Design a protein around this ligand. Structure first.
Ligand code: HEM
Length: 152
């Protein structure tokens, strides 16, 4: 549950991401894969990537980064009213991709890390607080759908 002031901060921060969605998406996935290598194993189309250089050079990874952040951005712009948008993602990630909720925690923190890295001194305490709450909300609603499906 975010205030409108907090949603305003979230969408303000998101403006930074939308100026370069592919660059942000790329670095988020790289931070995930390098920080938590077991996550790479869930992707049959990235599992071949052994080095970060190969990751950085991968146009398909950048493409998928765009798909992921486009989807997340669509969800964030709903300001919490994202049932329709979130349900198919929860379902595909639980039933098809088999992504435990822990990995969504991982990618949440990776987003926070990337924003600080690309915008040092431009991602204030209030902005981090708001973005963090937004990602927690996202994670929590996915977690509810996971519970429904009995997915661990
Ligand atoms: C903010 C969090 C995430 C968002 C918004 C997101 C979004 C998406 C979208 C839109 C797709 C393509 C459509 C679909 O299959 O549903 C997708 C596919 C996929 N996602 Fe995610 N995802 C997220 C987190 C993760 C994480 C943390 C993992 C694994 C560690 C993951 C694993 C996958 C895999 C394996 C696919 C299929 C890739 C392919 O073969 O094309 N996702 N995701």
């Amino acid at each position: 549950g975010l205030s409108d002031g907090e949603w305003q901060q979230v969408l303000n921060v998101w403006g930074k991401v939308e100026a370069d969605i592919a660059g942000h998406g790329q670095e988020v996935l790289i931070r995930l894969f390098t920080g938590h290598p077991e996550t790479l194993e869930k992707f049959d189309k990235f599992k071949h990537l052994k080095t970060e250089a190969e990751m950085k050079a991968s146009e398909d990874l950048k493409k998928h980064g765009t798909v992921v952040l486009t989807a997340l951005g669509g969800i964030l712009k709903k300001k919490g009213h994202h049932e329709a948008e979130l349900k198919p993602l929860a379902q595909s990630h639980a039933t098809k991709h088999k992504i435990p909720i822990k990995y969504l925690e991982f990618i949440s923190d990776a987003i926070i890390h990337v924003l600080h890295s690309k915008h040092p001194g431009d991602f204030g305490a209030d902005a981090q607080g708001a973005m963090t709450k937004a990602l927690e909300l996202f994670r929590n609603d996915i977690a509810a759908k996971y519970k429904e499906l009995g997915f661990q």
